[PDB]
Amino acid sequence: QLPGRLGDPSMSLGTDPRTDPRLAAALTQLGLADQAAEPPVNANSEVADCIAYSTAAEQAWQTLFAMLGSQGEPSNPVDVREETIKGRGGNEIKLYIHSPTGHTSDSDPLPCVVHTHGGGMVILTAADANYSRWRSELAATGLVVVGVEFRNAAGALGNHPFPAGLHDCADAAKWVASNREALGISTLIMSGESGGGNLSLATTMLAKKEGWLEEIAGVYAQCPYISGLYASKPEELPSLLENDAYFLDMKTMGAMVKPYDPTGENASNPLAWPYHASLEDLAGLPPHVISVNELDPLRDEGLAHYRKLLKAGVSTVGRTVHGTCHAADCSFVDVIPDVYFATVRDISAFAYSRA
Amino acid sequence: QLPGRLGDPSMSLGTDPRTDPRLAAALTQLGLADQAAEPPVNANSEVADCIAYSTAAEQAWQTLFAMLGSQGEPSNPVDVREETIKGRGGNEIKLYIHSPTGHTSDSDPLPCVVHTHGGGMVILTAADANYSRWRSELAATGLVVVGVEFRNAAGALGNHPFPAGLHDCADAAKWVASNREALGISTLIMSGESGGGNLSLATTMLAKKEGWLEEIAGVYAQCPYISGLYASKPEELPSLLENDAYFLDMKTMGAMVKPYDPTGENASNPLAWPYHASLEDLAGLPPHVISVNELDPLRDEGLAHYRKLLKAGVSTVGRTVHGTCHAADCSFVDVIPDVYFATVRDISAFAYSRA
Structure with missing residues (x-):
């Protein structure tokens, strides 16, 4: 039998033999083990309706993610402070700066992670408890972690289509790069998950285009x-079928593409959708790690991009985190702590390896 | 198209779109990118012939690994010393002990890795350049690494069938566990690849059987x-077909099984072949990481074991290393250094996480 829904169209995260049983149990309690429901909007819906749907959904997602993340704290003490910087267009960008307690500009410099959160570039915020927890767990390993509060296509921080969020992430990375002494940092890497994985990849491609690529040591x-491509069911990406409605569903994602790119004119623009990068777009980029989830419909586009980076001559490591739905290792610290912390340690070790 | 040879029976490491192109290029120059050849012996061959073949094959593998493994040294200085201990039956077991230069019994204790090398439990030695390099690279991250020179079923260190090598690995781990102060170590984990992955898993199961499990902090x-099962194509293990003759040839491995278990009486003994463990066999084991290679015919049995460990309630992380043939991240340091060191960092971070 072929895996997931390729072998059994009725299969879900709750019934898939690949799911980590601890995660399956937690998803069942959250109502997320069964196949995700069909949404009232899709890629053919009007932009305004896609925006409204995403905006209306945001708080419920924030509530769910927060409870995964608010019930504890890192083993080592961490400080968080806020700084506001100016974007290229004059907007104010909030940064959440996490560091080990006692870390100052007089300390031995630490590696830095500029963190770009998920939410499909459309919803969720850096202030959300799951993302604050993540940045603090990273900082606790001996890192300065800068959480960018970038503009979103919808929700509380909307409504700002591509390239607003990208520009904010780029401007934040540039600020960090020009404030190394003040932050007490050595090198800088970009990191994030899902829509934030997109933004970290795209920020680095943009740095190349803008002549500041040397500031970024890795991704x-x-x-x-x-x-x-969630509305188009491309044959090259079987995971979109295999794991459809495993937390994420194609129809919902197809609707969520629209607030980010309302005209559709950026469908093949690598800065909006990095999967579409040419080798030339990637040439000369610093070392990358691409880390995908096994039971994620997005798995194959991540792995395809991993292969593209290699073809372009970029130093690239590719990792599958087994037993996990989309982004589970970024959030489910109370249920799969071993997996969660394996990823935290991997990111931190990678950051250290660039210094 | 289905991946690898499932979609195209003529596919090889050299033509598979999944292979890391740096690895593909290196294999092509070594003549090892094409499908591996049909062996002169198989599972139906007399045991004596399988032993003779295995013994004859050892030199070719050692020569290949030597060139991959001796051309450099760790970024941090490492000392290596030798200690000889007594096995339970009275044989002498050599240990290669690697540590950061300056590390003594008076230093702050470091985490320890007891390393069990590969070679299908039949060939290769701890003194081989690739294994020495691996242990030194691990030590360079701040570890004491103990390389066990266990008895083999064939070759220079043969001919000792199951359970000889297992007993040697267990006895080495017990010695390390009884000499924590002298070695300057905190916790110890078992680690190794391929046949050494088998031995690390089996050593820990044997510790459970013998009541000294508490000494092992992780695997x-x-x-x-x-x-x-290399002679038989079990349908639950599609990778055996998908990636057959990618570096490893399954018909060949069917022959190499025989020196380990000449009577065949241990084919479903979990201490010889951990895949056959029951849920009860795995209950109570300490935290595990299972790290498989994407383009490896052995991939699926590793992932199946990962899932069984979870079903038994063991804390388990599962990782696929993409772009790689069997064990490539353990040896191809000059060709895919980012991948090689990502694994070194992952193992070390895991060891630290148990202390």
Whole structure:
């Protein structure tokens, strides 16, 4: 039998023999083990209706993710402070700066992660408890972690289509790069998951285009949401069928593409959807790690991009995190702590390896 | 198209779109990118002929690994010393002990890895350049690494069938566990690849059987060679077909099973072939990481074991290393250094996480 829904169309995260049983049990309690429901909007819906749907959904997702993340704290003490910087267009960008307690500009410099959160570039915020927890767990390993509060296509921080969020992430990375002494940092890597994996990849491609690529020492992109092809069911990406409605569903994602690119004119623009990068777009980029989730419909576009990076001559490591739905290793610290912390340690070790 | 030879029976490491192109290029120059040849012996061959073949094959593998493994040294200085201990039956077991230069019994204790090398439990030695390099690279991250020179079923260190090598690995681990102060170590994990993945898993199961399980804080098993089913195409293990003759040839491994278990009486003994463990056999084991290679015919038995460990309630992380043939991340340091060191960092971080 072929895996997932290729072998059994009725299969779900709750019934798939590949799911980590601890995660399956937690998903069942959250109502997320069964196949995701069909949404009232899709890729053919009007932009305004796609925006409204995403905006209406945001709080419920925030509530769910927060409870995964608010019930504890890192083993080592961490400080968080806020800084506001100016975007290229004059907008104010909030940064959440996480560091080990006692770390100052007089300390031995630590590696830095510029963190770009998920939510499909459309919803969720850096202030959300799951993302704050993630940045603090990273900082606790001996890192300065900068959480970018970038503009979103919808929701509380909307409504700002591509390239607004990308520009904010780029401007934040540039600020970090020009404030190394003040932050007490050595090198800088971009990292994030899902829509944030997209933004970390795209920020680095943009740095190349803008002549500041040397500031970025590496990229650790988790479960990247990078094809934009969820409405088109491309044959080259079987995971879209195999794991459809495993937390994420094609129809919902197809609707969520629209707020990011309302005209559709960026469907093959690598800065909007990195999966579409040419070798030339990637040439000369610093080392990358691409980390995908086994039971994720986005798995194959992440792995395809991993292969593209290699073809372009980029130093690239590719990792599948087994037993996990989309982004589970970024959030489910109370249920699969071994998996969660394996990823935290991997990202931190990678950051250290670039210094 | 289905992946690898499932979609195209003529596919090889050299033509598979999944292969890391750096690895593909290196294999092509070595003449090892094409499908591996049909062996002169198989599972139907007399045991004596399988032993003779295995013994004859050892030199070719050693020569290949020597060139991959001796051309450099760790970034941090490492000392190596030798200690000889007594096995339970009275044989002498050589240990290669690698540590950061300056590390003594008076230093702050470091985590320890007891390393069990590959070679299908039949060939290769701890003194081989690739294994020495691996242990030194691990030590360079801040570890004491103990390389066990266990008895083999064939070759220079033969001919000792199951359970000889297993007993040697167990006895080495017990010695390390009884000499923590002298070695300057905190915790110890078992780690190794392929046949050494088997031995690390089996050593830990034997510790459970013998009541000294508490001494082992974790297990990091790479590309484990654990089913013993290479002659038969079990349908639950599609990778055996998908990636057959990618570096490893399954008909060949069917022959190499025989020196380990000449009577065949241990084919479903979990201490010889951990894939056959029951849920009760695995209950109570300490945390595991199972790390498989994407383009490895052994991939699926490793992943199956990962899932069984979880079903038995063991804390388990599962990782696929993409772009790689069997064990490539353990040896091809000059060709895919980012992948090689990603694994070194992962093992070390796991060891630290148990202390």
